[PDB]
DNA sequence: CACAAATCCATTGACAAAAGAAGGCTAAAAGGGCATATTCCTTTTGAATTGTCCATATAGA
């Protein structure tokens, strides 16, 4: 939801794409940045979890 | 019992190692930005309290 608020603060309908198509990127980005940042007890940075 | 010499404690001085810093670097860590469409999760025993009827006492009709 926090990512969703991020998206709604930046949804652009002039381009004319349906909302869900645009909000999905932000919601997946938020959930994944979350899981990387706060799922380990000994946190490891984002780039390292991507590796 | 005084005078002559070897043996101690102190500064000069320089010299090398060592550490505190500083800059220059580079690995790394953290942001930010993504636009065909995504729409509601997977064993008993006992005591004490709480919510449920029962006795009953009283107040109107």
Coordinates of N, CA, C and O (backbone and C1' of nucleotides) in Angstrom, one line a residue:
Chain A
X1 N 0.8 -1.2 0.0 CA 0.0 0.0 0.0 C 0.9 1.3 0.0 O 0.5 2.3 -0.6
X2 N 2.0 1.2 0.7 CA 2.8 2.4 0.7 C 3.4 2.7 -0.7 O 3.4 3.8 -1.2
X3 N 3.8 1.6 -1.4 CA 4.1 1.7 -2.8 C 3.0 2.2 -3.7 O 3.2 3.0 -4.6
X4 N 1.8 1.8 -3.3 CA 0.6 2.2 -4.1 C 0.4 3.7 -3.9 O 0.0 4.4 -4.9
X5 N 0.5 4.2 -2.7 CA 0.4 5.7 -2.6 C 1.5 6.4 -3.4 O 1.3 7.4 -4.0
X6 N 2.7 5.8 -3.4 CA 3.8 6.3 -4.3 C 3.3 6.4 -5.7 O 3.6 7.3 -6.4
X7 N 2.6 5.3 -6.2 CA 2.1 5.3 -7.6 C 1.0 6.3 -7.8 O 1.1 7.1 -8.8
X8 N 0.0 6.3 -7.0 CA -1.1 7.3 -7.1 C -0.6 8.7 -7.1 O -1.1 9.6 -7.8
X9 N 0.5 9.0 -6.4 CA 1.1 10.3 -6.4 C 1.8 10.6 -7.8 O 2.2 11.7 -8.1
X10 N 1.9 9.5 -8.6 CA 2.6 9.7 -9.9 C 1.8 9.0 -11.1 O 2.4 8.8 -12.1
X11 N 0.5 8.7 -10.9 CA -0.2 8.2 -12.1 C -0.5 9.3 -13.1 O -0.9 10.4 -12.7
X12 N -0.3 9.0 -14.3 CA -0.5 9.9 -15.4 C -1.4 9.3 -16.4 O -1.1 8.4 -17.2
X13 N -2.7 9.9 -16.4 CA -3.7 9.3 -17.3 C -3.7 9.9 -18.7 O -4.2 9.3 -19.6
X14 N -3.0 11.0 -18.9 CA -2.9 11.6 -20.2 C -2.3 10.6 -21.2 O -2.8 10.5 -22.3
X15 N -1.3 9.8 -20.8 CA -0.8 8.8 -21.6 C -1.8 7.7 -21.9 O -1.8 7.1 -22.9
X16 N -2.8 7.5 -21.0 CA -3.9 6.8 -21.3 C -3.9 5.3 -21.0 O -4.8 4.6 -21.4
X17 N -2.9 4.9 -20.2 CA -2.8 3.4 -19.8 C -3.7 3.2 -18.6 O -3.8 4.0 -17.7
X18 N -4.3 2.0 -18.6 CA -5.1 1.6 -17.4 C -4.3 1.7 -16.1 O -3.1 1.4 -16.2
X19 N -4.9 2.0 -15.0 CA -4.2 2.3 -13.8 C -3.4 1.1 -13.3 O -2.2 1.2 -13.0
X20 N -4.0 -0.1 -13.3 CA -3.4 -1.3 -12.7 C -2.1 -1.7 -13.3 O -1.1 -2.0 -12.7
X21 N -2.1 -1.5 -14.7 CA -0.9 -1.7 -15.4 C 0.3 -0.9 -14.9 O 1.4 -1.3 -15.0
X22 N 0.0 0.3 -14.5 CA 1.0 1.2 -14.0 C 1.3 1.1 -12.5 O 2.5 1.2 -12.1
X23 N 0.3 0.7 -11.7 CA 0.6 0.6 -10.3 C 1.3 -0.7 -9.9 O 1.9 -0.8 -8.9
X24 N 1.2 -1.7 -10.8 CA 1.8 -3.0 -10.5 C 3.3 -2.9 -10.4 O 3.9 -3.6 -9.5
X25 N 3.9 -2.1 -11.2 CA 5.4 -1.9 -11.1 C 5.7 -1.4 -9.7 O 6.6 -1.9 -9.1
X26 N 5.0 -0.3 -9.3 CA 5.4 0.2 -8.0 C 5.1 -0.7 -6.9 O 5.8 -0.7 -5.9
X27 N 4.0 -1.5 -6.9 CA 3.7 -2.3 -5.8 C 4.7 -3.5 -5.8 O 5.1 -3.9 -4.7
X28 N 5.1 -4.0 -6.9 CA 6.1 -5.1 -6.8 C 7.5 -4.5 -6.4 O 8.2 -5.2 -5.6
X29 N 7.8 -3.3 -6.8 CA 9.0 -2.7 -6.4 C 9.0 -2.5 -4.9 O 10.0 -2.8 -4.2
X30 N 7.9 -2.0 -4.3 CA 7.8 -1.8 -2.9 C 7.9 -3.1 -2.1 O 8.7 -3.2 -1.2
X31 N 7.1 -4.1 -2.5 CA 7.2 -5.4 -1.8 C 8.5 -6.0 -1.9 O 9.0 -6.6 -0.9
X32 N 9.2 -5.9 -3.0 CA 10.5 -6.6 -3.1 C 11.6 -5.8 -2.4 O 12.5 -6.4 -1.7
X33 N 11.6 -4.5 -2.5 CA 12.5 -3.7 -1.7 C 12.3 -4.0 -0.2 O 13.3 -4.1 0.6
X34 N 11.1 -4.1 0.2 CA 10.8 -4.5 1.6 C 11.4 -5.8 1.9 O 12.1 -5.9 2.9
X35 N 11.1 -6.9 1.2 CA 11.5 -8.2 1.6 C 13.0 -8.3 1.6 O 13.6 -9.0 2.4
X36 N 13.7 -7.5 0.7 CA 15.2 -7.5 0.8 C 15.7 -6.8 2.0 O 16.6 -7.2 2.6
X37 N 15.0 -5.7 2.3 CA 15.5 -4.8 3.3 C 15.2 -5.3 4.8 O 16.0 -5.0 5.7
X38 N 14.1 -6.1 4.9 CA 13.8 -6.4 6.3 C 13.2 -7.8 6.4 O 12.2 -8.0 7.1
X39 N 13.9 -8.7 5.8 CA 13.5 -10.1 6.0 C 14.6 -10.9 6.7 O 14.3 -12.0 7.3
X40 N 15.8 -10.5 6.6 CA 16.9 -11.2 7.3 C 17.1 -10.6 8.6 O 16.9 -9.4 8.9
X41 N 17.6 -11.4 9.6 CA 17.9 -10.8 10.9 C 19.2 -10.0 10.8 O 19.4 -9.0 11.4
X42 N 20.2 -10.6 10.0 CA 21.4 -9.9 9.7 C 21.2 -9.3 8.3 O 21.4 -10.0 7.3
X43 N 20.7 -8.1 8.2 CA 20.3 -7.5 7.0 C 21.5 -7.5 6.0 O 22.6 -7.2 6.4
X44 N 21.3 -7.8 4.8 CA 22.3 -7.7 3.7 C 21.7 -6.8 2.6 O 20.5 -6.8 2.4
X45 N 22.6 -6.0 2.0 CA 22.1 -4.9 1.2 C 21.2 -5.4 0.0 O 21.1 -6.6 -0.2
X46 N 20.6 -4.4 -0.7 CA 19.7 -4.8 -1.8 C 20.5 -5.5 -2.9 O 20.1 -6.5 -3.5
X47 N 21.6 -4.9 -3.3 CA 22.4 -5.5 -4.4 C 22.8 -6.9 -4.1 O 22.9 -7.8 -5.0
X48 N 23.2 -7.2 -2.9 CA 23.7 -8.5 -2.5 C 22.5 -9.5 -2.6 O 22.7 -10.7 -3.0
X49 N 21.3 -9.1 -2.2 CA 20.2 -10.1 -2.3 C 19.8 -10.3 -3.8 O 19.4 -11.4 -4.2
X50 N 20.0 -9.3 -4.6 CA 19.8 -9.5 -6.0 C 20.8 -10.5 -6.6 O 20.4 -11.4 -7.3
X51 N 22.0 -10.4 -6.2 CA 23.1 -11.3 -6.6 C 22.7 -12.7 -6.1 O 22.9 -13.7 -6.8
Chain B
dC1 P 95.4 8.6 59.8 O5' 95.1 9.5 58.6 C5' 95.6 10.9 58.5 C4' 96.0 11.3 57.1 C3' 94.9 11.4 56.1 O3' 95.3 12.3 55.1 C1' 96.3 9.6 55.5
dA2 P 94.2 12.9 54.1 O5' 95.0 13.5 52.9 C5' 96.1 14.3 53.1 C4' 97.1 14.3 51.9 C3' 96.4 14.6 50.5 O3' 97.4 15.2 49.7 C1' 97.1 12.3 50.6
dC3 P 96.9 16.1 48.5 O5' 97.3 15.3 47.2 C5' 98.6 15.1 46.8 C4' 98.8 13.9 45.9 C3' 98.0 13.9 44.6 O3' 98.9 13.9 43.4 C1' 97.8 11.8 45.7
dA4 P 98.3 14.0 41.9 O5' 98.2 12.4 41.5 C5' 99.4 11.7 41.1 C4' 99.1 10.3 40.8 C3' 98.4 10.0 39.5 O3' 98.9 8.8 38.9 C1' 97.1 9.1 41.3
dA5 P 98.8 8.6 37.3 O5' 97.3 8.1 37.1 C5' 97.0 7.2 36.1 C4' 96.0 6.2 36.7 C3' 94.8 5.9 35.8 O3' 94.6 4.5 35.5 C1' 94.1 6.3 38.0
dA6 P 93.8 4.0 34.3 O5' 92.6 3.1 35.0 C5' 92.6 1.7 35.1 C4' 91.4 1.2 35.7 C3' 90.2 1.1 34.8 O3' 89.4 -0.1 35.2 C1' 89.7 2.6 36.6
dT7 P 88.2 -0.6 34.2 O5' 86.9 -0.3 35.1 C5' 87.0 0.6 36.2 C4' 85.7 0.6 37.1 C3' 84.4 0.4 36.4 O3' 83.4 0.1 37.3 C1' 84.6 2.6 37.0
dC8 P 81.9 -0.3 36.8 O5' 81.3 1.1 36.5 C5' 79.8 1.2 36.3 C4' 79.2 2.2 37.3 C3' 78.2 3.2 36.7 O3' 76.9 2.8 37.2 C1' 80.1 4.4 37.6
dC9 P 75.6 3.7 36.9 O5' 75.9 5.1 37.8 C5' 74.8 5.8 38.3 C4' 74.9 7.3 37.9 C3' 73.8 7.9 37.1 O3' 73.2 9.0 37.8 C1' 75.9 8.4 36.1
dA10 P 72.0 9.7 37.1 O5' 72.6 11.0 36.4 C5' 71.8 11.8 35.6 C4' 72.7 12.7 34.7 C3' 72.1 13.0 33.3 O3' 71.4 14.2 33.4 C1' 74.4 12.3 33.2
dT11 P 70.9 14.9 32.0 O5' 72.1 15.7 31.5 C5' 71.9 16.9 30.7 C4' 72.8 16.9 29.6 C3' 72.2 17.1 28.2 O3' 72.7 18.2 27.5 C1' 73.7 15.2 28.2
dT12 P 72.3 18.5 26.0 O5' 72.9 17.4 25.2 C5' 74.3 17.2 25.3 C4' 75.0 17.4 23.9 C3' 74.0 18.0 22.9 O3' 74.7 18.7 21.9 C1' 74.5 15.7 22.5
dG13 P 74.0 19.4 20.7 O5' 73.9 18.1 19.6 C5' 74.9 17.2 19.6 C4' 74.5 16.0 18.8 C3' 73.2 16.2 18.0 O3' 73.6 16.8 16.8 C1' 73.4 14.0 18.9
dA14 P 72.5 16.7 15.6 O5' 72.6 15.3 15.0 C5' 73.8 14.6 15.0 C4' 73.7 13.1 14.7 C3' 72.8 12.8 13.5 O3' 73.4 11.9 12.6 C1' 72.0 11.6 15.4
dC15 P 72.6 11.3 11.4 O5' 71.7 10.2 12.0 C5' 72.2 9.2 12.9 C4' 71.4 7.9 12.8 C3' 70.6 7.8 11.5 O3' 70.4 6.4 11.2 C1' 69.2 7.9 13.4
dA16 P 69.7 6.0 9.8 O5' 68.5 5.0 10.3 C5' 68.8 3.8 10.9 C4' 67.6 3.3 11.6 C3' 66.4 3.0 10.7 O3' 65.9 1.7 11.0 C1' 65.7 4.4 12.5
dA17 P 64.6 1.1 10.2 O5' 63.4 1.1 11.3 C5' 63.7 0.5 12.5 C4' 62.5 0.6 13.5 C3' 61.2 0.3 12.9 O3' 60.4 -0.1 14.0 C1' 61.2 2.5 13.5
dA18 P 58.9 -0.7 13.8 O5' 58.1 -0.1 14.9 C5' 58.4 1.2 15.4 C4' 57.2 1.9 15.9 C3' 55.9 1.4 15.3 O3' 54.8 1.9 16.1 C1' 56.4 3.5 14.4
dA19 P 53.5 1.1 16.2 O5' 52.4 2.2 16.4 C5' 52.6 3.3 17.3 C4' 52.1 4.6 16.8 C3' 50.7 4.6 16.2 O3' 50.1 5.8 16.5 C1' 52.3 5.5 14.7
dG20 P 48.7 5.8 17.2 O5' 48.1 7.2 16.8 C5' 48.8 8.4 17.0 C4' 48.4 9.5 16.1 C3' 47.0 9.4 15.6 O3' 46.4 10.7 15.4 C1' 48.5 9.3 13.8
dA21 P 45.0 10.9 14.7 O5' 45.3 11.5 13.3 C5' 46.2 12.5 13.2 C4' 46.5 12.9 11.7 C3' 45.3 13.0 10.8 O3' 45.4 14.0 9.9 C1' 46.8 11.5 9.9
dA22 P 44.1 14.6 9.2 O5' 44.8 15.5 8.0 C5' 46.1 15.2 7.6 C4' 46.0 14.8 6.1 C3' 44.6 14.8 5.5 O3' 44.7 15.3 4.2 C1' 45.5 12.7 5.3
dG23 P 43.4 15.7 3.4 O5' 43.8 15.6 1.9 C5' 45.2 15.5 1.5 C4' 45.3 14.3 0.6 C3' 44.2 14.1 -0.4 O3' 44.7 13.6 -1.6 C1' 44.4 12.2 0.8
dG24 P 43.9 13.9 -3.0 O5' 44.8 13.2 -4.1 C5' 45.7 12.1 -3.6 C4' 45.1 10.8 -4.0 C3' 43.9 10.8 -5.0 O3' 44.2 9.8 -6.0 C1' 43.5 9.5 -3.1
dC25 P 43.1 9.5 -7.1 O5' 42.6 8.0 -6.8 C5' 43.1 7.5 -5.6 C4' 42.9 6.0 -5.6 C3' 41.8 5.5 -6.5 O3' 42.0 4.2 -6.9 C1' 41.0 5.3 -4.3
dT26 P 41.3 3.5 -8.2 O5' 40.3 2.5 -7.6 C5' 40.8 1.4 -6.7 C4' 39.7 0.8 -5.9 C3' 38.4 0.4 -6.8 O3' 37.9 -0.8 -6.2 C1' 37.8 1.9 -5.1
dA27 P 37.4 -2.0 -7.1 O5' 36.5 -2.9 -6.1 C5' 37.0 -3.3 -4.9 C4' 36.0 -3.1 -3.8 C3' 34.6 -3.7 -4.1 O3' 34.1 -4.2 -2.9 C1' 34.4 -1.4 -3.7
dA28 P 32.9 -5.2 -2.9 O5' 31.7 -4.4 -2.1 C5' 32.1 -3.5 -1.1 C4' 31.0 -2.6 -0.7 C3' 29.6 -3.2 -1.1 O3' 28.7 -2.6 -0.2 C1' 29.9 -1.1 -2.0
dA29 P 28.1 -3.5 1.0 O5' 27.1 -2.5 1.7 C5' 27.5 -1.2 1.9 C4' 26.4 -0.2 1.6 C3' 25.0 -0.7 1.4 O3' 24.1 0.1 2.1 C1' 25.6 0.5 -0.5
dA30 P 22.6 -0.2 2.3 O5' 21.9 1.2 2.1 C5' 22.7 2.3 1.9 C4' 22.0 3.3 1.1 C3' 20.5 3.1 0.9 O3' 19.8 4.3 0.7 C1' 21.5 3.0 -1.2
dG31 P 18.4 4.7 1.4 O5' 17.6 5.3 0.2 C5' 17.8 5.0 -1.1 C4' 17.8 6.2 -2.0 C3' 16.5 6.5 -2.7 O3' 16.4 7.8 -3.0 C1' 18.1 5.7 -4.3
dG32 P 15.0 8.5 -3.4 O5' 14.8 8.1 -4.9 C5' 15.9 8.3 -5.8 C4' 15.4 8.2 -7.3 C3' 13.9 8.0 -7.5 O3' 13.5 8.5 -8.7 C1' 15.0 6.1 -8.2
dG33 P 12.0 8.7 -9.0 O5' 11.9 8.6 -10.6 C5' 13.1 8.2 -11.4 C4' 12.7 7.1 -12.4 C3' 11.3 6.8 -12.6 O3' 10.9 6.8 -13.9 C1' 12.4 4.8 -12.1
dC34 P 9.4 6.8 -14.4 O5' 8.9 5.3 -14.0 C5' 8.1 4.5 -15.0 C4' 9.0 3.5 -15.6 C3' 8.2 2.3 -16.1 O3' 7.8 2.5 -17.5 C1' 10.2 1.6 -14.9
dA35 P 7.0 1.4 -18.3 O5' 5.6 1.3 -17.4 C5' 4.8 0.1 -17.5 C4' 3.5 0.3 -18.3 C3' 3.7 0.6 -19.7 O3' 2.7 0.0 -20.5 C1' 2.8 2.5 -18.6
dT36 P 3.0 -1.2 -21.4 O5' 1.5 -1.9 -21.8 C5' 0.7 -1.2 -22.7 C4' -0.6 -2.0 -22.8 C3' -1.2 -2.5 -21.5 O3' -2.0 -1.5 -21.0 C1' -1.1 -4.3 -23.1
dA37 P -3.6 -1.6 -20.9 O5' -3.9 -2.9 -20.0 C5' -5.1 -3.7 -20.2 C4' -5.0 -5.0 -19.4 C3' -5.2 -4.8 -17.9 O3' -6.2 -5.7 -17.4 C1' -3.4 -6.1 -18.3
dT38 P -6.6 -5.7 -15.9 O5' -6.2 -7.1 -15.3 C5' -4.9 -7.4 -15.0 C4' -4.8 -8.5 -13.9 C3' -5.1 -8.1 -12.5 O3' -5.6 -9.2 -11.8 C1' -2.8 -8.6 -12.8
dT39 P -7.1 -9.7 -12.1 O5' -7.5 -10.5 -10.8 C5' -8.6 -10.0 -10.0 C4' -8.2 -9.3 -8.8 C3' -9.3 -9.1 -7.8 O3' -8.9 -9.3 -6.5 C1' -8.3 -7.0 -8.3
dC40 P -9.4 -10.6 -5.6 O5' -8.5 -10.6 -4.4 C5' -8.8 -9.8 -3.3 C4' -8.8 -10.7 -2.0 C3' -9.2 -12.2 -2.3 O3' -8.5 -13.0 -1.4 C1' -10.9 -11.1 -0.9
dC41 P -8.1 -14.5 -1.9 O5' -7.0 -14.9 -0.9 C5' -5.7 -14.3 -0.8 C4' -4.9 -14.8 0.3 C3' -4.9 -16.3 0.5 O3' -3.5 -16.7 0.5 C1' -5.3 -15.2 2.6
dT42 P -3.2 -18.2 -0.1 O5' -3.3 -19.2 1.2 C5' -2.9 -20.5 1.1 C4' -2.8 -21.2 2.4 C3' -3.4 -22.6 2.5 O3' -2.6 -23.5 3.2 C1' -4.5 -21.3 4.1
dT43 P -7.8 -37.7 22.9 O5' -7.6 -38.1 24.4 C5' -6.5 -37.5 25.1 C4' -7.0 -36.4 26.1 C3' -7.9 -35.4 25.4 O3' -9.2 -35.8 25.4 C1' -6.4 -34.5 27.1
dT44 P -10.3 -35.1 26.4 O5' -9.7 -35.2 27.9 C5' -9.4 -36.5 28.4 C4' -9.0 -36.4 29.9 C3' -10.2 -35.9 30.8 O3' -9.9 -36.4 32.1 C1' -8.5 -34.3 30.9
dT45 P -11.0 -36.8 33.2 O5' -10.8 -35.7 34.3 C5' -9.6 -35.0 34.4 C4' -9.5 -34.3 35.7 C3' -10.8 -33.8 36.3 O3' -10.7 -33.7 37.7 C1' -9.6 -31.9 35.5
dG46 P -11.9 -33.3 38.6 O5' -11.6 -31.8 39.0 C5' -10.3 -31.4 39.3 C4' -10.2 -29.9 39.5 C3' -11.5 -29.2 39.9 O3' -11.2 -28.4 41.1 C1' -10.6 -28.1 37.9
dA47 P -12.3 -27.6 41.8 O5' -12.0 -26.1 41.3 C5' -10.8 -25.8 40.6 C4' -10.5 -24.4 40.6 C3' -11.6 -23.5 41.2 O3' -11.0 -22.2 41.5 C1' -11.7 -23.3 38.8
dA48 P -12.0 -21.1 42.2 O5' -11.8 -19.9 41.3 C5' -11.6 -20.1 39.9 C4' -11.8 -18.8 39.1 C3' -12.9 -17.8 39.6 O3' -12.7 -16.6 39.1 C1' -13.6 -18.9 37.7
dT49 P -13.6 -15.3 39.4 O5' -14.0 -14.8 38.0 C5' -14.0 -15.7 36.9 C4' -14.3 -15.0 35.6 C3' -15.4 -14.0 35.7 O3' -15.4 -13.1 34.6 C1' -16.2 -15.9 34.7
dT50 P -16.6 -12.1 34.3 O5' -17.5 -12.9 33.2 C5' -16.9 -13.6 32.1 C4' -17.9 -14.0 31.1 C3' -19.1 -13.0 30.9 O3' -19.5 -13.0 29.6 C1' -19.9 -15.0 31.7
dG51 P -20.6 -12.0 29.1 O5' -21.9 -12.9 28.7 C5' -21.8 -13.8 27.7 C4' -22.9 -14.9 27.8 C3' -24.3 -14.4 27.7 O3' -25.1 -15.4 27.0 C1' -24.0 -15.5 29.7
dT52 P -26.7 -15.2 26.8 O5' -27.3 -16.3 27.8 C5' -27.0 -17.6 27.7 C4' -27.9 -18.5 28.5 C3' -29.4 -18.3 28.4 O3' -30.1 -19.5 28.3 C1' -28.7 -18.2 30.7
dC53 P -31.6 -19.5 27.9 O5' -32.4 -19.3 29.2 C5' -33.6 -20.1 29.6 C4' -33.3 -20.9 30.8 C3' -34.5 -20.9 31.8 O3' -34.5 -22.2 32.5 C1' -32.7 -19.8 32.8
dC54 P -35.9 -22.8 33.1 O5' -35.5 -23.1 34.7 C5' -34.8 -22.1 35.4 C4' -35.0 -22.3 36.9 C3' -36.5 -22.4 37.4 O3' -36.5 -22.8 38.7 C1' -35.7 -20.2 37.8
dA55 P -37.8 -23.0 39.6 O5' -37.7 -21.9 40.8 C5' -36.8 -22.2 41.9 C4' -36.9 -21.1 43.0 C3' -38.3 -20.9 43.6 O3' -38.1 -20.6 45.0 C1' -37.7 -19.0 42.4
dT56 P -39.4 -20.2 45.9 O5' -38.9 -18.8 46.5 C5' -38.0 -17.9 45.8 C4' -38.6 -16.5 45.7 C3' -40.1 -16.4 46.1 O3' -40.3 -15.2 46.8 C1' -39.9 -15.6 44.0
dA57 P -40.5 -15.2 48.4 O5' -40.2 -13.7 48.9 C5' -39.2 -12.9 48.2 C4' -39.9 -11.7 47.6 C3' -41.2 -11.3 48.2 O3' -41.2 -9.9 48.5 C1' -41.4 -11.4 45.9
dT58 P -42.5 -9.2 49.2 O5' -42.5 -7.7 48.6 C5' -41.5 -7.3 47.7 C4' -42.1 -6.7 46.5 C3' -43.4 -5.9 46.7 O3' -43.5 -4.8 45.9 C1' -43.7 -7.6 45.1
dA59 P -44.1 -3.4 46.4 O5' -44.8 -2.8 45.1 C5' -44.1 -2.8 43.8 C4' -45.1 -2.7 42.7 C3' -46.4 -2.0 43.2 O3' -47.0 -1.2 42.1 C1' -46.8 -4.2 42.4
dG60 P -48.3 -0.3 42.4 O5' -49.2 -0.6 41.2 C5' -48.8 -0.4 39.9 C4' -49.5 -1.3 38.9 C3' -51.0 -1.0 38.8 O3' -51.5 -1.4 37.5 C1' -50.7 -3.2 39.6
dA61 P -52.7 -0.6 36.9 O5' -53.8 -1.8 36.5 C5' -53.4 -2.9 35.7 C4' -54.4 -4.0 35.8 C3' -55.8 -3.5 35.9 O3' -56.7 -4.4 35.2 C1' -55.2 -4.8 37.8

